[PDB]
Design an enzyme around this catalytic site. Sequence first.
Site, mmCIF file in Angstrom:
data_model
loop_
_atom_site.group_PDB
_atom_site.id
_atom_site.type_symbol
_atom_site.label_atom_id
_atom_site.label_comp_id
_atom_site.label_asym_id
_atom_site.label_seq_id
_atom_site.Cartn_x
_atom_site.Cartn_y
_atom_site.Cartn_z
ATOM 1 N N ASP A 93 77.908 54.248 15.283
ATOM 2 C CA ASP A 93 78.358 55.634 15.247
ATOM 3 C C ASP A 93 79.881 55.673 15.288
ATOM 4 O O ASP A 93 80.496 55.158 16.228
ATOM 5 C CB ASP A 93 77.762 56.414 16.417
ATOM 6 N N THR A 140 75.555 59.877 10.236
ATOM 7 C CA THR A 140 76.986 59.607 10.150
ATOM 8 C C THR A 140 77.291 58.304 9.422
ATOM 9 O O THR A 140 78.421 58.119 8.958
ATOM 10 C CB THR A 140 77.604 59.574 11.550
ATOM 11 N N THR A 141 76.315 57.400 9.314
ATOM 12 C CA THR A 141 76.526 56.162 8.571
ATOM 13 C C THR A 141 76.930 56.451 7.129
ATOM 14 O O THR A 141 77.876 55.852 6.604
ATOM 15 C CB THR A 141 75.259 55.304 8.617
ATOM 16 N N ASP A 196 69.221 62.541 16.488
ATOM 17 C CA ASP A 196 69.715 63.121 15.246
ATOM 18 C C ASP A 196 68.597 63.645 14.356
ATOM 19 O O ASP A 196 68.883 64.379 13.404
ATOM 20 C CB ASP A 196 70.545 62.091 14.478
#
Lengths: 65, 515, 525, 480
Positions: free
Chosen positions: D50, D83-84, D346
Amino acid sequence: GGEKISGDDIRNQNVLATMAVANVVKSSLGPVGLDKMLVDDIGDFTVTNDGATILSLLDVQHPAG
Amino acid sequence: DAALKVNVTSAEGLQSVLETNLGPKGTLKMLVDGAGNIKLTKDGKVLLTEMQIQSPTAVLIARAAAAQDEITGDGTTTVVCLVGELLRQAHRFIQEGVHPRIITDGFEIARKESMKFLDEFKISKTNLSNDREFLLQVARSSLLTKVDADLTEVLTPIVTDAVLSVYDAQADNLDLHMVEIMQMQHLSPKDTTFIKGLVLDHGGRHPDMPTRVKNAYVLILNVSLEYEYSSADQRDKLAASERKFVDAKLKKIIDLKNEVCGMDPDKGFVIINQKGIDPMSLDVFAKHNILALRRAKRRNMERLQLVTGGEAQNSVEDLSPQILGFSGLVYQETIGEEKFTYVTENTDPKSCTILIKGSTHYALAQTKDAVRDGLRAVANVLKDKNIIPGAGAFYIALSRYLRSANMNKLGAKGKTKTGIEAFAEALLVIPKTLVKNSGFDPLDVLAMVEDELDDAQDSDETRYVGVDLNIGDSCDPTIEGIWDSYRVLRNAITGATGIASNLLLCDELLRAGRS
Amino acid sequence: DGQIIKSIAAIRELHQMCLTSMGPCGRNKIIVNHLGKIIITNDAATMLRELDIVHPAVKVLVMATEQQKIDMGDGTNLVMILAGELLNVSEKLISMGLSAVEIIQGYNMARKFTLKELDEMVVGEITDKNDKNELLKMIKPVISSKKYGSEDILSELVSEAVSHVLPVAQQAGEIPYFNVDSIRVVKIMGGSLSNSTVIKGMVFNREPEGHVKSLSEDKKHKVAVFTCPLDIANTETKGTVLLHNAQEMLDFSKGEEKQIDAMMKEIADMGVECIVAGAGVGELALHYLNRYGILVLKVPSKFELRRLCRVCGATPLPRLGAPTPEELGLVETVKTMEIGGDRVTVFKQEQGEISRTSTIILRGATQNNLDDIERAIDDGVAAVKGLMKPSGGKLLPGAGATEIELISRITKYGERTPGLLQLAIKQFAVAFEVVPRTLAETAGLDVNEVLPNLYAAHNVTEPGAVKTDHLYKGVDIDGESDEGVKDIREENIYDMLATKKFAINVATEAATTVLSIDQIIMAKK
Amino acid sequence: SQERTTGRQAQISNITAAKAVADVIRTCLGPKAMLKMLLDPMGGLVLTNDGHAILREIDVAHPAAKSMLELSRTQDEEVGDGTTTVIILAGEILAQCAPYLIEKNIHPVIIIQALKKALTDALEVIKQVSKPVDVENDAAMKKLIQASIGTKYVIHWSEKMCELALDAVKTVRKDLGQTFEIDIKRYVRVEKIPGGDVLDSRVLKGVLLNKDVVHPKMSRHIENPRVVLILQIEEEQVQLMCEQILAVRPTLVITEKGVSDLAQHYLLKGGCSVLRRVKKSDNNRIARVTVGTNCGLFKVEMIGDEYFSFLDNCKEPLSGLQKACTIMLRGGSKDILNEIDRNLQDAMAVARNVMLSPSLSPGGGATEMAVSVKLAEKAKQLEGIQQWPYQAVADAMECIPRTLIQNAGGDPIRLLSQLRAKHAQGNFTTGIDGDKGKIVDMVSYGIWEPEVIKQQSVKTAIESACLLLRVDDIVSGVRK
């Protein structure tokens, strides 16, 4: 608590140092200008075109300015 | 044995030095000193000279290249590359408890078995027929390992036609027969032109010297030509007697020159001296159509005997027609402050002169180092008719026989087998370095080579599989034309074994002496 | 790691300064060496010769400019400018990790195509190479390679000196004789720039210390070159005087005085009013020449005497004696005159006899500006070498407009040759836009509007027709440059074929030389 | 103190601020992405993929890079999903504005004019490549959560893990009848207790009360558990609360504290099961749904660590608004439970964005290639002064999939050359395969993302570059 300065230096060194600071803020004049970054030293900053905000946080060692 | 790993770790960093200079696709590394000499080359002898070293073990690496300069002189990077792979395997297998000499003894057995398979892998060729296709392919692989492809296409016929001048029915190759290389700054380095005749490095220093001549008569001198009271009348006689020593020799030159034929001075004549020239002699040389020099070399005079049968004379006492040679055509070129004389149209010249033109010093240093290293490598090819397929085909093929031995070559169980698997995988770092210098994946290319060798071995067919670094695929050294001399690879494996035993057999580092 | 940080940061340091060194707008710079001598010049190639440089990659590019002075030496500061732009385009490829082998092949394939396009840019070869009318098209733009203060005087003096300093012949082939020393650089402070003219004679700096009476009307002077100084024969070693009786003591001084009298009288018997002496003159000689009134010459070592070899045409003779006419030169008038306010030795020949050489008097107030004029004189000899050595110099569009059309040609070369190098050639095809970028930076113009207008004026070739306008199109340097694209042929602004032929050929290997350096190994001292 | 930069020094220092960091995050993109290590002032390290905690712990000497963390927080609060493949886009802009800035002497406002025009054409491309799908099908969202969890081995448990969150997704929803499917998933808290199996998680449509009843052996069934919003002191005071609720005759009891012995007499006479103290936040969960009525059934379970209580309304209305529930996560080990929380937490924003924009944009580098072609097409049509800066914006979107190729270590030129044809001309579903590093169909392989992922990112990313082009002078070292 200090000495005094007289002669043409007051009409110059105090005026030229003011011109040096005055030439900095001229980049924000007009919609075609740019905005200055004011860093708060805490990790965050405020980029604004307001002259009252920039000159307030700007360090000025000359009482004439 | 706490200090055993000290010399192993310090010497490990010596591999990255020449790692990028290996292979035809290798790159260049710049080394510049404080004296103003800019040397950009792939040669390790120059890079290891002025460069400061930390681990003293690098001194033995430079000593291992001494025997490689005489036998090979080019492609010596593989010497340190086999040591770098050994140093990575050093702390690996020695940590297992195996004594270092046991691994060293395993290399002696593997070296003897390598020479047995060395004769089967090589392909014998005939150098008597003077095959042009074979010479163009071998010289092409040598030029790519030194200079770029622009100079490769130019120097390929140059090196090929140079080695054909020195040969005989007895296979007599004299490396000192063709040596002198002409170093000049003219045009661009890619304009280098090969000449089968002889080239002189000096020319007329006076405007009245002969501009163009046909038959030249060379008079070679060595000993210095430049010469150094009751009343003032004696002072005038001593100064006037200083020129009598030179004028006495000038009167002999006038009569002995016109001896044979003095009617038409339309041919060439040259006087060559080692030291400075007397300005008084230029007045006689101008009216007599005599070419003169100032500050001329010596060793270049010995080449007149190998072509036109000239003679280099020292003193002024001996003057014979044998000293005066002959030439078919002479073309004199003026470059800089020293005119240059070319001797062409020779009857049967036995030595070729290499004329290299370029821009500046570092531009000439790349070609000067490439010709000397490239000519001596090809000269050794004609010495031994046995030719070994190159392109790293032997290093991969020999490993296949070493990985599988069992009842064939075994010896001790685990003591010799450790050295067998070590030396078998120590030769696989060379093809991995060749691909890494080209920018591709060495394992994906090697995986296709191993799959190709497995298909060729199971099909029961004799084939040599190489590695093409341009397209990143496998190739055949016979089709591409990459070859190697017998003495190059034999002394490389034997030389690598001798230098490997130096670092492996060092037990401990000791510091003793006066601070 | 050396190419990413050490190579790029060190070369870009001097690359920003070279932007003002090319074009008619070229700006001078002040460079003070370690010895304290101040140097002011507008030529970056002249800077790098006297400049102290540490990082080796910059020193390698200095030798590329030295080779240009041997061949062209006219507007060759692009070698530093173009290489800087080629590294900037390569800097984008270095961060991407593109193989340096494909980069070297990009310049090699482009160099072969560039040399072929230069043969299509030649228009209107000038075969006369003699009169000022035909040479005006060649010489005038060469004057723009340097300070633009006066382009009328510098272009007129070079075009006028053709028939003077250069060898004059009916038809001269086979590499006619030319020399850098055919024009002597005489720097005398004072006087307007318009006072500079071409003189068929020769001027030396020195003051005769004697009784000298200048002969003007009758002319007919005899001059000879003497290797040894004027005196009786001297022993090179140190002797010892031998005195015994009164005859040796009294006649010791009379021996050296009477012999030099008869020695110097033989020179006066030939009607010799002036001499050329490479060495000094003894005191006994000047005392006896007071009666005869024979000149002496104090000039320095033969590097100055090399000019007198063509002027007088005399062979240096060590012995004095009676020089034969072979060693006797000819000069019309020898008189000390005041040109720029100082009294120096001046050879003034109304109509003289002189071989393949002459001089040009330079009149200016600032001596530092005279240093740039000396470099401008070398450009005149470079213009002669550019015409004489090759079969011809043809003509080429000047003002840096040459490579503007070459971008459209090389861009098509990448498209016409598909492959992995198709994108690599296009990156090197547009890399020539630095030439108008460099000049417009010093021209006071904004490259944002101007540069696409240059491509819009040239287009591909022309609209539908048979003609070429783009050959006559180029960037405008003038106060009217804000109006549009001015032509060239109207002002006769041209370039030479060999100028860009030798520059690109050297810059091709020079760009790949820096990119071929994996690591720079240095040492102390 | 001054610390002021003028002229060319001002632009160079600000570009290199986030330029060195952009090369560090190149390993954070894709399912093949690496794991970055951090160094705090205490010497400890945190190993995670992250980028939110990466830029927070790393201290940059230049203040210009501090905004990128704040610009990253905006995308994390608005989206915060995957977010990757998302947050890396924050540093792919300034790196591509470097080639022409000072060299052409172009004023930053001129670049700002090209930045405003690039956002106009970018909004049309986002919804152009998007395609609608059935919004009521829960099977489509099952394969979507499985795409972002590929950094771990949880794919084996993905059957229970995906259905764990998706049962709460359809449970909440419903903030409006018509105009848009707004919801709030923050009311659903995920408790992580080490030990046990993931199958111990109980989730369904309703309000999950996580607490126990009076006695573990008490009856597990209640007919209509209607919900309503030392020893001597506890028995008297609590009785005045729980028993007072019985005036409307509910069969369900909710108290702040436990039930004493005296209260058990009058609470058990109602013929139902009595529920003791309920968690504080659980009262806010039922406050959204509902004196509440229409509760279908009650159930209680027993396991060593903590206990469970099931409360099923089963009819919200008689319109209405969203329902809230609770989730307990039981991992296999201590270190395994804490690391897998990033993918499961998430998952709330994964299906939340599906309700916002049912249209689906292509993922796996296909969106960045689609925008790069459209920006390159409009560049030659517009021309003008924007030709140079607006073309470099197209190259900025082209370097984003180059970062994904960096994980494989190949030549992006070979792949991008084929993507300019099969993608632009062929279809928007063409992209780069993450596992094999090849060109395959993204929809067929299963790589896709909601439109809100690309819409709220690229639009925010373009607007985030405004602060980078407005920099002139920097003033620090005074006060605030």
